Each structure stands twice: as structure tokens, then as C-alpha cells.
User: Which sequence fits this backbone?
């Protein structure tokens, strides 16, 4: 599929709070579709979808999420709780004069668009998530306890204390992104026992090979983006589990009634497809896509499949 | 009508050439409507139309024209010929992924949108001009000669030599804009015999009163905008008459066939309504509005009337 060159894009900026402005890239005309990337990514993670969606007749707004890229990265950890992040995205729509938008997210952006649909359905025309399932909060089980009962989420405890994971991820950015952005069959990093091994990359090469999914030029773009604000803002998305849990609990007796799509990825070994298995009981109008041979980095692993799934669903359920 | 606060707007930037980026403000969803201001104005001259058009179901893109505001102001005079300006606006649409837009202009922006419709009709869904008529080039009469046969366009000869009008318009910006932005019954400046009187403001108060059309805060916004690049870029729009005439002559045997609207203003003593009188012979699908008691500064003189005319025409002929 056709990709984006960053300097041939229209760049938009919206101030949603005194020291917080959101940056986005904008392409096409038609119904507004807002794309929300995950950790640790960029608007550029949507590079294969932006031209394709615009060509299909949508107005694509591909965000730099708060903490990333050209968006502001306030220093405070609580600025990255889901409650604040969602209300800023509503303000974003307000300042653009958009009554509604389709929201499509991946990874942490998938979590965000689910909560947008849950708490601001009147502002969400339709919602789609790649990899990230929607699991309603259990008001009887705290979040950090649910993380210890699952060993693959152990890197999340390593991410908790400010400054620790930042030093490792920032020490060599090219190594960081070449180590992360890999197909499942190429994966080089261990998510289990990160805390007993000292860090996330201790048992990965100092000069890793380039994944089949990405070019050297595409890696260097992410590198350039993360030189701006570093990893603190991105990591802060993980540092609000108790507040996110308390907020999510305030919604418990309610369903998501708007058109919705869940896209699972066969080889995402962290956000595994089985984690989505009873989403229908909460989301009555939920539709599904599923991508075989697809790892965690869904948009760049299987861009053609992603594009086909999204455009078919947009054309029937969002338009 | 509701106006705009500049800090609650979404701001967009598009690079159309190596050292030229266009700034615009963006509000609403629906068909793309691009608003092009005149001399010496700003996107903010559309402040009463932007919320109203967006509320009526349009996606408003209100430009800072090249040379103004947050848009680039390259130094070269030939960068502001109509030929270059229009091709940049096509590039603008290209980079936004817009196949077409409605173009609405006033004053020099009215001239620009007429030439967009003439040379790039496939990119103009519909075209509207406030005050500025469309008069096809006379290939037998040079432009500076046509200006001497009309005494009201004598300030245009004063505008020709670089640096001269700049010194007068820049010497006190608040005085400049308070002197210009006035109703016809309040007008304080003489357009005739500017060159024999030495300048444009020689016979106007050093501390002029504030027009009924504008507040002190609105004046100071223009003042702040013109501190950025000064008047050279704006004045350069007048310094390309021979090239604009040669380019316009290349189109001579052709009509404008797209939906079109000409809005005349009873009390614009420079762009007088009579100047539009045989536009129908060139623009077969031309419709008309006419605003009584309206001077040159149409959008802020009669904003409610302008809004009503534009929305009625957009809803029938552009949508
Ligand atoms: C509320 C709270 C939560 C949450 C939550 C929600 C969405 C996403 C994430 C998340 O961590 N995304 C990063 C995954 C990424 C990664 C991992 C480590 C470091 C950097 C990047 C990765 C990379 C390769 C890979 O390949 C494979 F699959 F491993 F082979 C898989 C994943 C966390 N909570 O407690 C519960 N229960 O939701
Ligand atoms: C191709 C070439 C051309 C052209 C062209 C096209 C469109 C617009 C203009 C233009 O000059 N716009 C500025 C008017 C403005 C002004 C005047 C002087 C200084 C600053 C601002 C003004 C202010 C108050 C006012 O009030 C009233 F009506 F006077 F009472 C009227 C006008 C020139 N050409 O040779 C021919 N023939 O088109």
C-alpha cells in the first residue's frame, strides 16, 4: 500500500488545555475518522492506512497522542490517566467543530477509543480497535493485582517507577525501535521476567537486524520523534492503573451501543485474541475482523488486510 | 453573529513549496469551503462567517493568504503573481487530499478565487466573490494604462515601488487599521490623488476614532499579525499587474461553467457594483447577492447579511 511522506502532509494543532496542544496529520474529505496509535508509536504508525482511508472517502485525522511527537508532553504523571486523555479528545473535537468522529485505535490508543465509546458515545460515530480488547473493570480486583496473575504483563511493573524504563529505552533509540518493531517470528525481546533480568533489552543484540516490516528510514523517523520528548510521557500511560480502574468502575452497569469493530491479531502474544472472547455481551452491535500471521504491530505487519477490514466496516456501519 | 477567539481554533499548516507554508484555521465538518481574504486582512476577517458556515454543515478552511499572518512571506515580488498564488492553492488542496473545494474570496482573495475557477475549474466545486467582479483581460490594453483611466485606482500606483507604501502603513499599525477598517459613512482616507498628496494617510487624524464595525481588541489582533511580516508581502499582490494580465490573456476564449455567486456592496466606492454588470455573459450559471448600506469591509460591515447569502447559495448550488 501507499505510505506517507511526513513533509507532504497537512499538520494540524489544537490547544485543548493551557499547556497542552495536540498535533495531528490530516488527509481527505468525508466523515471524520480519528486514528489513535499505541506505545511507543506515532501518527506515522498509520502511514499505510491514512492514504487508503482518504481514498475510500474519509477525512483522516491521525494523531500524535499526548506525550508523543509534536504533541505536548506535560510532566505530571496524572495528566496521562484515561479520564484526562478522553476529555481532552472531546475538547479536541469541540475545537475542530466536529459533533462526532469515528475513532480507531491500536494498543493503548485502542484502550482510549474504547473508553471514548463508553463514556462519550454521543461524540463517537463508531469505534474500532486493533488488538486491544474491551474488558469491563472488575470492582473487586485491583489493577496491579490482576497484572501479577499474568506473567506476560510483567514489563508493566518494570514501567512503573519514573526514570527506570526511560533510561533503558532512551539509551539508544535506534536499538530500541529496531528491537521492538519486529514480526512475531523475528521477535528478539522477552516480556517475561523483565524485572529479574534487570531490563527489557538485556538479552537482545546491541545492533539488532532490521525487521522485514520496516526500512532504515522509517526507523529513523521514530528516532527523530522520540528525541523531542523522550519516553516519560509515553510510559506515563502505564502509571495510572488505579485511577483508570476507579474511573472505569464508575461506568460498570452499562453497554456500548454504537457501531463497533474488534480486530484480533493471531500472533500478538500479549494482546491475544482470546482476551476479546466475550466482548459481544457488552457491545451488542460488535463486528469482528481477524488477521492471521499478524503480530502486535498490526498496521505495518499486515497493512493491506487492515486497510481492507477497516474500509469494509466503515462503508457499512460508520457511513 | 458569533465570532471566533483565535486561541480556541484548530490551526493547520501545509508546505506548498520549499520555503512557503500556508496557515489556515479549520472548523466544522461537511463539504470543504476555503475562504480567501483581501488586502490588508487576515483569516480573522472571516470571524463572523466561520462559525456560521460550520454550523450550517460545512468544513471551513479560512486562510492566511501568502504574505500574511502565520503564512510564509517570501521576499520575491514575483512570488505574488496570480499564476503562482493559484498553483499553490491547488497544491494546498493536493496536500490536504481534497479533490475539490468551494472557494469564497473577498477583495484580492476574490480576484484569486475567480482565477482558480477560470484555470482550475476541475478543482473548484463552486466559487463566490464579495465585491470583486470578474472582468476578462483586454489583450489590447495594458494594466497600468487601465489604472490611469480610473482615478480611484491611483493608490495602486503609489503601491508600486517597493518600500514606499510599506513605510507609511507600518509607521503606526494601530493608526493604519483604525483608518482603513471603517464604514463608508465613517471613511477618513482619500483614495484619489494619493500620489500628489504624498501618501495615503496624510489627510487623516493621527489618532483616529474607532469604527462602529470593530472593537479595540479586534484592531490589536490585526496589529499583532502585521508585526510578523509587515506590509511588503501584502503590497506585492499589486506589483504583478503585467504578469497577471499576460496570464489572464492566455485564457481569453473561455467561460466559467461551475456554480458561481457574485455579491455586490452598495457603498464600496472602489469595487463598485456596476463593475460586475456583464459578468453573466462569461459565467452562465452566475447567481447574485447584493447588500445595501455595505461598504468595502463586507464581512464585518454586514456579517448577518453575508452569512445568510452564503449559506442559502451553498445549500442550493454547492451542496
Ligand atoms: C489497564 C492496564 C493495561 C494495559 C495495556 C493496554 C494495551 C496495551 C498495553 C501494552 O503494554 N502495549 C505494549 C505492547 C508492546 C510492548 C511491550 C513491552 C514493551 C514495549 C512495547 C508489544 C511489543 C511486541 C509484542 O510482540 C509479542 F506479542 F510479544 F510477541 C507484543 C507487545 C497495555 N492493565 O493492568 C490491563 N490488564 O489491561
Ligand atoms: C488587476 C489590477 C487589480 C486589482 C484589485 C482587485 C481587488 C482589490 C483591489 C484593492 O485595491 N483592494 C483594496 C481596497 C481597500 C484599500 C484601498 C487603499 C488602501 C488600502 C485598502 C479599500 C478600503 C476602503 C474603501 O472604502 C471606500 F470604498 F473607498 F469608500 C474601499 C477600498 C485591487 N487592476 O489594474 C484592475 N483594474 O483590476
Assistant:
Amino acid at each position: 500500500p501507499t505510505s506517507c511522506n511526513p513533509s507532504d502532509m497537512s499538520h494540524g494543532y489544537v490547544t485543548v488545555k493551557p499547556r497542552v496542544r495536540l498535533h495531528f496529520v490530516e488527509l481527505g474529505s468525508g466523515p471524520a475518522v480519528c486514528l489513535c496509535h499505541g506505545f511507543p508509536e506515532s501518527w506515522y504508525s498509520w502511514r499505510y492506512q491514512i492514504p487508503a482511508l482518504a481514498q475510500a472517502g474519509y477525512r483522516v485525522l491521525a494523531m500524535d497522542m499526548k506525550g508523543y511527537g509534536e504533541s505536548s508532553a506535560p510532566p505530571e504523571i496524572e495528566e496521562y490517566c484515561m479520564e484526562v486523555l478522553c476529555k481532552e479528545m472531546v475538547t479536541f473535537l469541540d475545537k475542530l467543530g466536529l459533533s462526532q468522529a469515528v475513532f480507531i485505535g491500536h494498543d493503548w490508543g485502542g484502550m482510549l477509543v474504547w473508553y471514548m465509546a463508553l463514556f462519550y458515545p454521543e461524540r463517537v460515530r463508531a469505534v474500532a480497535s486493533l488488538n486491544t480488547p474491551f474488558i469491563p473493570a472488575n470492582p473487586n480486583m485491583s489493577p496491579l493485582e490482576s497484572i501479577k496473575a499474568n506473567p506476560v504483563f510483567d514489563y508493566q511493573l518494570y514501567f512503573q517507577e519514573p526514570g527506570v524504563a526511560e533510561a533503558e529505552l532512551e539509551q539508544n533509540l535506534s536499538r530500541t525501535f529496531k528491537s521492538l518493531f519486529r514480526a512475531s517470528d523475528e521477535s528478539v525481546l522477552s516480556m517475561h521476567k523483565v524485572c529479574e533480568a534487570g531490563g527489557l533489552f538485556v538479552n537482545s543484540p546491541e545492533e539488532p537486524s532490521l525487521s522485514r516490516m520496516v526500512t532504515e528510514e522509517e526507523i529513523q523517523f521514530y528516532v527523530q520523534q522520540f528525541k523531542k520528548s523522550g519516553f516519560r510521557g509515553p510510559l506515563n500511560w502505564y502509571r495510572n492503573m488505579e485511577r483508570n480502574w476507579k474511573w472505569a468502575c464508575k461506568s460498570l452497569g452499562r453497554k456500548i451501543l454504537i457501531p463497533a469493530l474488534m480486530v484480533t491479531a493471531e500472533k500478538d502474544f500479549v494482546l491475544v485474541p482470546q482476551m476479546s472472547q466475550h466482548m459481544e455481551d457488552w457491545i451488542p452491535h460488535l463486528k469482528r475482523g481477524h488477521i492471521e500471521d499478524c503480530g502486535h504491530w498490526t498496521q505495518m505487519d499486515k497493512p493491506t488486510e487492515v486497510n481492507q477490514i477497516l474500509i469494509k466496516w466503515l462503508d457499512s456501519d460508520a457511513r
In short: Residues 1-319 of chain B form one domain.
